[PDB]
Design an enzyme around this catalytic site. Structure first.
Site, PDB file in Angstrom:
ATOM      1  N   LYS B 110      16.840   3.956  38.308  1.00 30.05           N
ATOM      2  CA  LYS B 110      17.420   2.657  38.641  1.00 30.05           C
ATOM      3  C   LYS B 110      16.412   1.521  38.665  1.00 30.05           C
ATOM      4  O   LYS B 110      16.439   0.660  39.542  1.00 30.05           O
ATOM      5  CB  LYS B 110      18.137   2.733  39.990  1.00 30.05           C
ATOM      6  CG  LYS B 110      19.352   3.635  39.984  1.00 30.05           C
ATOM      7  CD  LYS B 110      20.155   3.479  41.255  1.00 30.05           C
ATOM      8  CE  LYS B 110      21.447   4.248  41.174  1.00 30.05           C
ATOM      9  NZ  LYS B 110      22.256   3.966  42.390  1.00 30.05           N
TER      10      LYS B 110
HETATM   11  N1  LIG Z   1      14.250  -5.530  50.293  1.00 29.83           N
HETATM   12  C1  LIG Z   1      14.823  -5.206  49.365  1.00 29.83           C
HETATM   13  C2  LIG Z   1      15.561  -4.814  48.204  1.00 29.83           C
HETATM   14  C3  LIG Z   1      16.431  -3.728  48.259  1.00 29.83           C
HETATM   15  C4  LIG Z   1      17.207  -3.395  47.152  1.00 29.83           C
HETATM   16  C5  LIG Z   1      17.120  -4.146  45.983  1.00 29.83           C
HETATM   17  C6  LIG Z   1      16.230  -5.214  45.929  1.00 29.83           C
HETATM   18  C7  LIG Z   1      15.452  -5.554  47.030  1.00 29.83           C
HETATM   19  C8  LIG Z   1      15.945  -6.112  44.727  1.00 29.83           C
HETATM   20  N2  LIG Z   1      16.050  -5.458  43.409  1.00 29.83           N
HETATM   21  S1  LIG Z   1      14.834  -4.447  43.023  1.00 29.83           S
HETATM   22  O1  LIG Z   1      14.954  -4.073  41.576  1.00 29.83           O
HETATM   23  O2  LIG Z   1      13.531  -5.168  43.202  1.00 29.83           O
HETATM   24  C9  LIG Z   1      14.840  -2.973  43.963  1.00 29.83           C
HETATM   25  C10 LIG Z   1      15.562  -1.884  43.706  1.00 29.83           C
HETATM   26  C11 LIG Z   1      15.297  -0.842  44.501  1.00 29.83           C
HETATM   27  C12 LIG Z   1      14.357  -1.020  45.432  1.00 29.83           C
HETATM   28  S2  LIG Z   1      13.796  -2.623  45.273  1.00 29.83           S
HETATM   29  C13 LIG Z   1      17.367  -4.974  42.961  1.00 29.83           C
HETATM   30  C14 LIG Z   1      17.833  -5.929  41.859  1.00 29.83           C
HETATM   31  C15 LIG Z   1      17.673  -7.389  42.294  1.00 29.83           C
HETATM   32  C16 LIG Z   1      16.438  -8.018  42.156  1.00 29.83           C
HETATM   33  C17 LIG Z   1      16.267  -9.332  42.581  1.00 29.83           C
HETATM   34  C18 LIG Z   1      17.335 -10.025  43.144  1.00 29.83           C
HETATM   35  C19 LIG Z   1      18.570  -9.399  43.280  1.00 29.83           C
HETATM   36  C20 LIG Z   1      18.741  -8.083  42.856  1.00 29.83           C
HETATM   37  C21 LIG Z   1      18.446  -4.891  44.044  1.00 29.83           C
HETATM   38  N3  LIG Z   1      18.111  -3.943  45.117  1.00 29.83           N
HETATM   39  C22 LIG Z   1      18.793  -2.641  45.053  1.00 29.83           C
HETATM   40  C23 LIG Z   1      20.139  -2.674  45.780  1.00 29.83           C
HETATM   41  C24 LIG Z   1      20.571  -3.637  46.590  1.00 29.83           C
HETATM   42  N4  LIG Z   1      21.768  -3.283  47.048  1.00 29.83           N
HETATM   43  C25 LIG Z   1      22.080  -2.104  46.519  1.00 29.83           C
HETATM   44  N5  LIG Z   1      21.074  -1.730  45.734  1.00 29.83           N
HETATM   45  C1  LIG Z   2      19.864 -13.838  40.926  1.00 30.46           C
HETATM   46  C2  LIG Z   2      19.871 -12.392  40.529  1.00 30.46           C
HETATM   47  C3  LIG Z   2      18.587 -11.952  39.873  1.00 30.46           C
HETATM   48  C4  LIG Z   2      20.948 -11.586  40.757  1.00 30.46           C
HETATM   49  C5  LIG Z   2      21.044 -10.127  40.393  1.00 30.46           C
HETATM   50  C6  LIG Z   2      22.394  -9.513  40.778  1.00 30.46           C
HETATM   51  C7  LIG Z   2      22.390  -8.012  40.939  1.00 30.46           C
HETATM   52  C8  LIG Z   2      22.703  -7.559  42.341  1.00 30.46           C
HETATM   53  C9  LIG Z   2      22.128  -7.149  39.920  1.00 30.46           C
HETATM   54  C10 LIG Z   2      22.120  -5.633  40.072  1.00 30.46           C
HETATM   55  C11 LIG Z   2      23.164  -4.881  39.235  1.00 30.46           C
HETATM   56  C12 LIG Z   2      22.831  -3.417  39.076  1.00 30.46           C
HETATM   57  C13 LIG Z   2      22.117  -3.108  37.782  1.00 30.46           C
HETATM   58  C14 LIG Z   2      23.148  -2.474  40.016  1.00 30.46           C
HETATM   59  C15 LIG Z   2      22.823  -1.007  39.877  1.00 30.46           C
HETATM   60  O1  LIG Z   2      22.612  -0.392  41.153  1.00 30.46           O
HETATM   61  P1  LIG Z   2      23.828   0.432  41.723  1.00 30.46           P
HETATM   62  O2  LIG Z   2      24.335   1.476  40.784  1.00 30.46           O
HETATM   63  O3  LIG Z   2      23.347   1.056  43.051  1.00 30.46           O
HETATM   64  O4  LIG Z   2      24.902  -0.658  42.082  1.00 30.46           O
HETATM   65  P2  LIG Z   2      26.349  -0.514  42.639  1.00 30.46           P
HETATM   66  O5  LIG Z   2      26.706   0.913  42.929  1.00 30.46           O
HETATM   67  O6  LIG Z   2      26.389  -1.421  43.895  1.00 30.46           O
HETATM   68  O7  LIG Z   2      27.230  -1.147  41.536  1.00 30.46           O
END
Ligand SMILES: N#Cc1ccc2c(c1)CN(S(=O)(=O)c1cccs1)[C@H](Cc1ccccc1)CN2Cc1c[nH]cn1
Ligand SMILES: CC(C)=CCC/C(C)=C/CC/C(C)=C/COP(=O)(O)OP(=O)(O)O
Ligand SMILES: [Zn+2]
EC number: 2.5.1.58
Lengths: 407, 323
Positions: B110
């Site tokens: 992921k």
């Molecule tokens: N603190 C914190 C934190 C936690 C998770 C996370 C993100 C930050 C931001 N990013 S990510 O790719 O940098 C991460 C994924 C998994 C651990 S950090 C991920 C993608 C993202 C990045 C930047 C802004 C918004 C979304 C989102 N996630 C994973 C998530 C959130 N809810 C369900 N799955």
């Molecule tokens: C401004 C900005 C950069 C916004 C980003 C928005 C956003 C939250 C993108 C993440 C989408 C994604 C690839 C989820 C996969 O995790 P998962 O399989 O755990 O997600 P899920 O089960 O909740 O669909």
């Protein structure tokens, strides 16, 4: 009535909202059931402990978590070493929503830190010495606008930023997330967000962008990362928000979209899921629910006469109940769902969603809905940028007095 | 060649072959914010990464260093970029690098950066021979991995590997008919192959869906798919649909079927159907049944549709104020 239950999730009828697997079990139903079972325990806890429910947003606890993290983080955040500006934004915005002042000692340290993250060629990187990237660039600009002081504004190199944005622009209207990087709807939004706030939007910068975003809307009504992908809340928010900035919301089939997002709110849990047939997640309290204010504004722009004048098109009360009862860490900070560990990302978005679900605003009309104790009310947030509506106006008003790089 | 998790792993400052390099500590400034208290291993690797990057040293040892920096934080896109620079400068064997990225992805599926890196490799090599199988393995651990499905669509499109995807889709739908990602992949394969204008195909699809809906009445994916493939041409364009859905309310009912009914009525009213008013009232009663009983979480939505439908389809909707 005395027999009546004020909390929507604790009413007896609510039990009827439990999953109906039609006696056909698959990984999806099994998973949905586990969560519902866990959420039911939370809801029922008051009845089992023989206590009258009180929904309290643990302010002081969240403030401590935020106050500290803004300055120092454990090695648990090594995975976010390339997203430090994000950490600044999520934290500063959480404090902003909680209505905590940003000491000038902090504002200046923040400004200086973001300067170190800024690249000689435009945009910000995830940390000092790291290459620029649109995500941390969107966070940096946002963080600086939240501070909103002359010092913060001046950190941003507007000519370079524009150059950078152009170096990522693709022939088909899309943008790369960074040099040598991938393309997805997130880049469209990050670019539109920073370019509009700093007023560096030239006549051709976003040419084709609205059309490319529109191509990401699929058969589900929602928007996917790139043309052809499953509809997802995060990307959908990104697509709509960008279109709203470009004034091209109409490029989308707003109706099928509205139907798709409204179906993303869980009938039992109350919070939103990211995509059809997946689990509820507190951060979607923003990405998904934050879409309704955007839609209300677009539909209203079209003169739609059916639009409510005191509520968004989602169960506001039920979302506040989910966040308040299932997403707060007693030690401070918020989270995905019961059982998950806290983090600043979820603190930021669980709170942003809560704010949105508490405040309805359509020009003159202003109606609030604050579940639990009144002290729970937060500062409102702008549905496009996710920073104080005031910070948005202040920021744009400052950069509009500057010439668009090149004139 | 010493794994980041090897029991005999040694920090870089304690390695003979790196004695010539001065690590470049991180420039966090005088008074840091969101300062991460790195572990000794993490800071050690990145202090040396900062050095190689700074000197833009394109060496075999720098290459090996990026593997450790990536494992400490696979999301560091700056390190992935430098690694790709080294892959080309050093003329590294890309199949060996392919072996590496499939291991990393299996480990952290992921993450955005690992998938983008694999895509770049496939592009360079112009070889998609391992893609469908590898993705299938990832999907076998998480049938809904967003990056996995995105990579799969890219590979299939860019290399035109449509031939067996529908079969794959049928396999996963059997495993979990509730997998919305698979319903999306199904619409993906058809739209780019036969399309849905071919009446035999569209017919087949709706038959299949209704079949699935019968088997799992409450699975929203089937319902959304059914609406998706017919909504563009117009729901009212298919007169037998309504009756066939009504013949499900008895047993196979759900707030989903009711919502569809409203959708059909809405489109009908949108194409001046027979018994305009009778249809409208049928829809307004369903909207209310949903908003107050069957689908209350969406009460605001349903009340909106209720208003909309009346706002433009009541007999008095196109009647002058003075009348
Ligand atoms: N603190 C914190 C934190 C936690 C998770 C996370 C993100 C930050 C931001 N990013 S990510 O790719 O940098 C991460 C994924 C998994 C651990 S950090 C991920 C993608 C993202 C990045 C930047 C802004 C918004 C979304 C989102 N996630 C994973 C998530 C959130 N809810 C369900 N799955
Ligand atoms: C401004 C900005 C950069 C916004 C980003 C928005 C956003 C939250 C993108 C993440 C989408 C994604 C690839 C989820 C996969 O995790 P998962 O399989 O755990 O997600 P899920 O089960 O909740 O669909
Ligand atoms: Zn989340």
């Amino acid at each position: 009535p005395v027999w009546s239950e004020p909390l929507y999730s604790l009413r007896p009828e609510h039990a009827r909202e439990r999953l109906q697997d039609d006696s056909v079990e698959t990984v999806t139903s099994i998973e949905q059931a586990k969560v519902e079972e866990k959420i039911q325990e939370v809801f029922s806890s008051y009845k089992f402990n023989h206590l009258v429910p009180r929904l309290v947003l643990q302010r002081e606890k969240h403030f401590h978590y935020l106050k500290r993290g803004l300055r120092q983080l454990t090695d648990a955040y090594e995975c976010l070493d390339a997203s430090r500006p994000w950490l600044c934004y999520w934290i500063l915005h959480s404090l902003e929503l909680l209505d905590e002042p940003i000491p000038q000692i902090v504002a200046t340290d923040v400004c200086q830190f973001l300067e170190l993250c800024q690249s000689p060629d435009g945009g910000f990187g995830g940390g000092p010495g790291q290459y620029p990237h649109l995500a941390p660039t969107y966070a940096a600009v946002n963080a600086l606008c939240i501070i909103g002081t002359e010092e913060a504004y001046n950190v941003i190199n507007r000519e370079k930023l524009l150059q950078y944005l152009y170096s990522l622009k693709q022939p088909d209207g899309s943008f790369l997330m960074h040099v040598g990087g991938e393309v997805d709807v997130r880049s469209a939004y990050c670019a539109a967000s920073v370019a509009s706030l700093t007023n560096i939007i030239t006549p051709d910068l976003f040419e084709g962008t609205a059309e490319w975003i529109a191509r990401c809307q699929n058969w589900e009504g929602g928007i996917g990362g790139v043309p052809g992908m499953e509809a997802h809340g995060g990307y959908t928010f990104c697509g709509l928000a960008a279109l709203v900035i470009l004034k091209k919301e109409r490029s989308l089939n707003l109706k099928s979209l509205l139907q798709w997002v409204t179906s993303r709110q869980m009938r039992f849990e109350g919070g939103f899921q990211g995509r059809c047939n997946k689990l509820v997640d507190g951060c979607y309290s923003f990405w998904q629910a934050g879409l309704l204010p955007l839609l209300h504004r677009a539909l209203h722009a079209q003169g739609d006469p059916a639009l409510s004048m005191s509520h968004w098109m989602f169960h506001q009360q039920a979302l506040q109940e989910y966040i308040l009862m299932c997403c707060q860490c007693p030690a401070g900070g918020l989270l995905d769902k019961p059982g998950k560990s806290r983090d600043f990302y979820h603190t930021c978005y669980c709170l942003s969603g809560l704010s949105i679900a508490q405040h309805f605003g359509s020009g003159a009309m202003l109606h609030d809905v604050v579940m639990g104790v009144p002290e729970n009310v937060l500062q409102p947030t702008h549905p496009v940028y996710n920073i104080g509506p005031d910070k948005v106006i202040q920021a744009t008003t400052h950069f509009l007095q500057k010439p668009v790089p090149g004139f | 060649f010493l794994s980041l998790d090897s029991p005999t792993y040694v920090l870089y400052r304690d390695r003979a072959e790196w004695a010539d390099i001065d690590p470049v500590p991180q420039n966090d400034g005088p008074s840091p914010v969101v300062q991460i208290i790195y572990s000794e291993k993490f800071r050690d690797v990145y202090d040396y990464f900062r050095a190689v990057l700074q000197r833009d040293e394109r060496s075999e040892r720098a290459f090996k260093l990026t593997r450790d920096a990536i494992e400490l934080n696979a999301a560091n896109y700056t390190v992935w970029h430098f690694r790709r620079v080294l892959l080309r400068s050093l003329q590294k064997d890309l199949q060996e690098e392919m072996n590496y990225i499939i291991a990393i992805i299996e480990e952290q599926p992921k993450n955005y950066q690992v998938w983008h890196h694999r895509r770049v490799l496939v592009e360079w090599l112009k070889d998609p021979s391992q893609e469908l199988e590898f993705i299938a393995d990832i999907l076998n651990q998480d049938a809904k991995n967003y990056h996995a499905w995105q990579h799969r669509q890219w590979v299939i499109q860019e290399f035109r590997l449509w031939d067996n995807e529908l079969q794959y889709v049928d396999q996963l739908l059997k495993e979990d008919v509730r997998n919305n990602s698979v319903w999306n992949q199904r619409h993906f394969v058809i739209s780019n192959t036969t399309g849905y204008s071919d009446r035999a195909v569209l017919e087949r699809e709706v038959q299949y869906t209704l079949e699935m809906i019968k088997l799992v009445p409450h699975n929203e994916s089937a319902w959304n798919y059914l609406k998706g493939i017919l909504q563009d041409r117009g729901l009212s364009r298919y007169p037998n649909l309504l009756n066939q859905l009504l013949d499900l309310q008895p047993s196979h009912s759900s707030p989903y079927l009711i919502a569809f009914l409203v959708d059909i009525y809405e489109d009908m009213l949108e194409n001046q159907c027979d018994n305009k008013e009778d249809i409208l009232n049928k829809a307004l009663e369903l909207c209310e049944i949903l908003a107050k009983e069957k689908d209350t979480i969406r009460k605001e939505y349903w009340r909106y549709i209720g208003r909309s439908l009346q706002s433009k389809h009541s007999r008095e909707s196109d009647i002058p104020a003075s009348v």
